[PDB]
Symmetry: C3
Subunit: 149 residues, 3 copies
């Protein structure tokens, strides 16, 4: 009994793992996930940057980061409005870094941006043009999370 039931439950668990992996694949597919491409998702809610980071972290994703022109357009299409990107110069003013780590390998700044305007701007938003503007991290913009290809 004991050993047999234990062996069966191991098989029951592996079956459930396989099934959950399928559920995730189907949901990603339904979410527009393209083959071999990372995918962006939004609930269309606008919130401060800290909340966006906390939200994506919960979902085991990261705040969306465009690494090239295609991903930048992809993010733009998903958000439809201004949205925070996983980029900030919070650590050292003027030096924008990825929340995931490292210096920018790609950027699409609007003319004369980033400008740390007025009281200060350490976060980044992709606007209704695909272009970027640094803005207050306390301002509320669309939450867009990224998940791996």
């Amino acid at each position: 009994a004991i050993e047999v039931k234990l062996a069966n439950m191991e098989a029951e668990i592996n079956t459930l793992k396989s099934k959950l992996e399928l559920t995730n694949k189907l949901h990603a597919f339904s979410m527009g996930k393209k083959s071999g491409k990372k995918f962006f998702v939004t609930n269309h809610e606008r919130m401060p940057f800290s909340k966006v980071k906390a939200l994506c972290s919960e979902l085991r994703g990261t705040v969306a980061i465009p690494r090239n022109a295609e991903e930048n357009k992809a993010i733009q299409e998903v958000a439809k409005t201004s949205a925070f990107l996983g980029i900030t110069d919070e650590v050292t003013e003027g030096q924008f870094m990825y929340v995931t780590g490292g210096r920018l390998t790609y950027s699409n700044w609007k003319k004369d941006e980033p400008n740390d305007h007025g009281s200060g701007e350490d976060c980044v938003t992709i606007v209704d043009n695909g272009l970027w503007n640094d803005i207050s991290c306390q301002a509320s913009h669309t939450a867009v999370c990224e998940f791996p290809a």
Copy 2:
């Protein structure tokens, strides 16, 4: 050996349970659930009120209920068309109650409504501009379910 295998399987189970809850969270987020707000969803199918109650119940949710103007608007944008709300005046005519208990607080009746028209109307539908109209529970309207915030 056996106690070690069992312990390892219990760990696998805890991990799988967390992964499923994550799947639930990402799905709700992808379908528009806002932080700290109830999740409203529809399959766009129109059916009698009894069927909407049975369907939402099966999904472990309930027929959508607007507790305030914000939720009323939220439901309005999910439904697109006329939809049943989880409210009825089946016990005492004119006394609308939530199907989950309690007397109706917030309301958004259309002019001349509720009129318990014809042979009687004890259900409620959210219609044009998010206003309400009592209607026969036998009529078919869009099924919208709500899940906790």
Copy 3:
């Protein structure tokens, strides 16, 4: 007590099976699955027919198959562009068969189709007005999967 832990693990597994089934049901509902009707999903990616088949198969579904006008309309709405159907005459030229088996019955061919044009056309795409056209299985069209009623 080993047996007590095993019985709890059994209950944990059954609970998980029940919850995964609920998650699947809620997801199908959110994707527009109507009661007792099969449902359709797409990620809007265009690809050759063999890729669509592989993709849907992996998700435990099949390339969308319109069995009647209602389903045809539903697939058209979901796809929004030209998309492959789970129908081909690859096995015997002129005789279209469902990828899951059986000879084609209901059809919605555009005038003058199918025509196995040029070197040949053994696949089928739902196109404009929802009509059908046979086309090369090598061409890239939208991937649409169907899942059981």
